[PDB]
């Protein structure tokens, strides 16, 4: 019943393929709310102009 989100940002230069580097991910946020998530989506803000 806890939703845990870990995050990490890193400046990069290469275009497409994921770099052959190493970096851990810190614990960022915990949510003590119980849900039965099975599927997830993604949100974009297209240039409506």
């Amino acid at each position: 019943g806890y939703f845990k989100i870990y995050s990490k940002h890193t400046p990069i230069n290469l275009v497409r393929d994921l770099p052959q580097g190493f970096s851990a991910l810190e614990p960022l946020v915990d949510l003590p709310i119980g849900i039965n998530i099975t599927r997830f989506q993604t949100l974009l803000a297209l240039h409506r102009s």
């Binding site: 019943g1 003590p32 709310i33 119980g34």
Partner: protein
């Protein structure tokens, strides 16, 4: 209701709030703090950090 300035006990407005503590499957989330004592050093003690 018949609230009047000269109404005695039993007819005056009574403000009543009822608190219901439910303990369902979700983790408990409402309760008070714990008293923290003064910190000591360099003495064989016991602690609940």
């Amino acid at each position: 209701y018949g609230f009047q300035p000269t109404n005695g006990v039993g007819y005056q407005p009574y403000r009543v709030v009822v608190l219901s503590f439910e303990l369902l499957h979700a983790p408990a989330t409402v309760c008070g703090p714990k008293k923290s004592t003064n910190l000591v050093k360099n003495k064989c003690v016991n602690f609940n950090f």
